[model samples]
Target chain A: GMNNRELYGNIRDVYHLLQKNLDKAIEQYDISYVQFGVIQVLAKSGKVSMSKLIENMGCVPSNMTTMIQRMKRDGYVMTEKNPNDQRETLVYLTKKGEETKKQVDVQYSDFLKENCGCFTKEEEGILEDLLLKWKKHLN
Target chain B: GMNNRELYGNIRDVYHLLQKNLDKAIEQYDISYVQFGVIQVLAKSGKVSMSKLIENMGCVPSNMTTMIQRMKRDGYVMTEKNPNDQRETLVYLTKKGEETKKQVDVQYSDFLKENCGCFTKEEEGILEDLLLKWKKHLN
Candidate 1:
């Protein structure tokens, strides 16, 4: 009944819908998905290098630098010199950043509940299965 | 052989993996996803309302406002207040924004050729068919 081109449309639609919801989430919490991920990682890891962050964030320098600038301004992170590698800057979460992660996480979970809670358990299960094969393809 | 719940997981996984690829694409072109989106909408519609953008972006106000702010700062958008609704702002793409959209769209097509270039038309057709059924369930 459908084809690969059709699949692209559905995937596109789903991605757009979810992205909208996430952007809305930013209102109550001022963080992009990338921003939240960074704070969460720093809170969990204590400190991480720019290279590792580049991999995690999957972002290039321009975006990363801009976001970091904002984070530094907001006091979410502090940068320290990597003594061994002068080119690298090590990033650490501030106290504010750590606390903010918990707050944001709770807010995101609540939003998810509002959106995804309506789905029946059985419906949710079906959706999960369809997406896993694609996950394996990525890894 | 898979049930519906199994299907949803696959959907979610594929969706996110797709985002990863998209992340890399726009970054290589030196922009955030929302930034590209703003340009794309403007390119298509000439000019649009913030409310329309909020709908088209499927993003919440926080992310949307921030993206708009950045775009405005970058001279990619000329933001004007709606005279009828003081609460609303209207966004028009600057010449820079229009040019950027054309540039990015070209790059995206090129990137897809290099990356997902392996997909056959036949294979894509079947994949699309299966996804269409899944996507329509939301509405």
Candidate 2:
């Protein structure tokens, strides 16, 4: 009982900082954090399927659809049907999208490195271990 | 020295599940997860001054102000001048705010109890320790 993370304070801190970091990082893309996040997720893979994107992003359908639509409007990317799974829409990075991602990602990574650069490799492992535990608990 | 958080997939699950659980716990709140968050922070000392809130919230000043302004319009809380600190404005909860908070708090405690109830004291501490250390590393 004495040890439970049961406080809203720390939870709030995590979300707040993440939001701040994300916002500051996404200044390059001229987009909000989540919208940039969608691009970043799609950037590396070249193409990602719809449900896969949701699973990767850890968000609800409505938010994903709304962001995707906006992104398509912005001409950053597009979605098409997966040949193997006709019902599944696949998201991919356009040439512009990839370039945007490249620029934004470098900025975001550098920013995170500025903040998290102090962590040793060992410490990074421990942190990753714990986040994994949270994932397992979630699953 | 390679840890795999980049490949690990559990954060969104925990976040969304807890969010949904919170929604189920308080259906009458008519708020999104982020809105509930701002209200809860305001409820804590009955008032939070602007600068203190920005610091505590760890968010961009613009985002914090915008969100709080929205909350003000929603009649969830109020912001007033902090005469003691002319540069600061205090965020305060209204009677409706406090009444809603009392109910929300009860449900929050219940929600934590029901979900994290299985966590041992030591395990919980370890979890917090791991998380905070990671946060410190990030910072």
Candidate 3:
């Protein structure tokens, strides 16, 4: 039987391992797991404020700025002054970004299906149930 | 019922949420999650080479060096030249570092127990089993 610390460690290790696999799977798309997260959010939201993006991504302002700079440099996203609020910066996906988002979606979906193939249907249900229950307590 | 993408997103969200909770729990210790990871590794391995530490932590050398520098500045650890391998630098915990490790262990254990209280013993076992099986495929 695992103790609380061991269980926590296992969860942490699994998260890292899964992240590594996802990164490898999406490497050909020339974006990272975190960057893909941004793409998904932008694709869904149309245009969003930089502050809103930081909140959604749960990252600090400086880090968000750096990531946005890199994404802009790579032609994944563009930023402009918000017309409604000139103090705010708005971000939206470029054409290339949208196309990459579609390609990455297919790639990432396949990656998820392949990695989750370890579990049976029932096991998947049970695991998902357990995770949701745990997450409820966390939030 | 959650689809595969939803399940994957839930897992990612839960991991991030739990990490945030842990950071809050240990905020009084004045260390970040990644720094505490370094502390744990150094506590276990005693004096380890920088290369070995980087490998163990699964981080890039530049980031590792930056972290070690901060840790050294904060008095959690110290580095020295290896006698046998003059070019290699070894790191170990200081007296304060060892004391902090003991305190942090107790605090982290309590944190784990509190967060995991949502689960019954049986549920905990099931969750751990599912995670282990999933991690096996990832590794």
Candidate 4:
């Protein structure tokens, strides 16, 4: 279908714009959109392994390692060697990290609501249904 | 607006899956999705300055430079100093690049059609309309 490219292009545009909006909204927190994702995972699943973090975040090991190092330095997270497993590393949010996460979540939800205000309640339901149908098809 | 997250999440999933599909389909051509984007631009514009390419593709200068170097090494593209402007570098598709692009377009369209098969014709139209409405709102 000729509309395929346009369809995909629009979706890409929306995704990028949403990311940019979230990045802007969270800029004051000194964390990136990707870092916010990490924070969310950490807040939910406390003290996970490095490998588990990689899996949960769907990020490359090298990039994740670098990000974790920076996050640790920035006091958003901390890492330590696993006591029971010499080769393993454990990662978790610090007190500051938890506090930041809470603030960011509020901002994130507000951003979502404001950005999605373009649609009516009915339109939102329709769009959500269509998107899920497409996603299900893809999967 | 609780559905906002789910709506955005579904769109992100669709976008990512489509990208993954395109990457896999074009893997045989040995071109990454980003390179294919460059090829499409080059194919359409014939020859353009490095800055023009960067602007069209919405990519950073450093990454564009690296990607052009790799594409040049792979014989998919070639670069030359601009005649009228000493500071400018020009980029364009090789014959191999054009041929690969044609093949990839076929595969891309096929991939889209197949992936979008889950939607009936009416559903596709509805989805497209809703997407456009949301996109307009975002802008």
Instruction: Give the number of the best model, judged by lDDT.
Output: 3
Best by TM-score: 3
Instruction: Say which prediction, candidate 2 or candidate 4, comes out ahead on DockQ.
Output: 4
Interface RMSD after interface superposition, each candidate: 6.4, 5.0, 3.2, 3.0
Model 3 Cα lDDT, one tens digit per residue, B22-90? 889889999977888888888889799988888888433225777788899999999999999899999
lDDT of 1 by residue, B38-85 (tens): 787777775678888877764333457777887899888899988888
Q: What's the true lDDT of residue B55 in model 3?
A: 82
Candidates' TM-scores?
0.58, 0.64, 0.87, 0.83
Candidate 2 interface RMSD, angstroms, 1 decimal? 5.0
Question: Which wins on lDDT, candidate 1 or candidate 2?
Answer: 1
Each candidate's DockQ: 0.19, 0.21, 0.51, 0.48
Give model 1's DockQ, 2 decimals: 0.19
Report the TM-score of chain B alone for all candidates.
Answer: 0.82, 0.67, 0.89, 0.90
Task: Please list the Cα RMSD from the true structure of every candidate, rounded to 1 decimal place.
Answer: 6.7, 5.8, 2.8, 3.2
Interface RMSD of 4: 3.0
Query: Candidate 1's residue-wise lDDT over A26-130, tens digit each?
Result: 666677666876886677675789777877553333467678879999888888889999998999898898888878876666555544444457645544544
Backbone clash count for every predicted candidate, in the order shown: 37, 0, 0, 0
lDDT by residue for model 4 (A1-139), tens? 7776667776777877777787898999988777998998889898999989887873232257777899999999999999999999999999999999888888998988877777778887778778778777776
What candidate 4 keeps of the native contacts, as a fraction, is: 0.59
Clashing pairs in 2: none
Q: What interface RMSD, in Å and to 1 decimal, does model 3 have? A: 3.2
Which digits, one per residue and each the tens of the lDDT, describe model 2 over residues A14-105?
54465566677777667877777678678756687888888777454335676788889898889888888787898887888878877886
Error of 2 at A129 (Å): 5.0
lDDT of 4 by residue, B1-139 (tens): 6677777677777877777777887888887778988998899897999888988884232257877999999999999999899999999999999888888988888887777667777877887787778677766
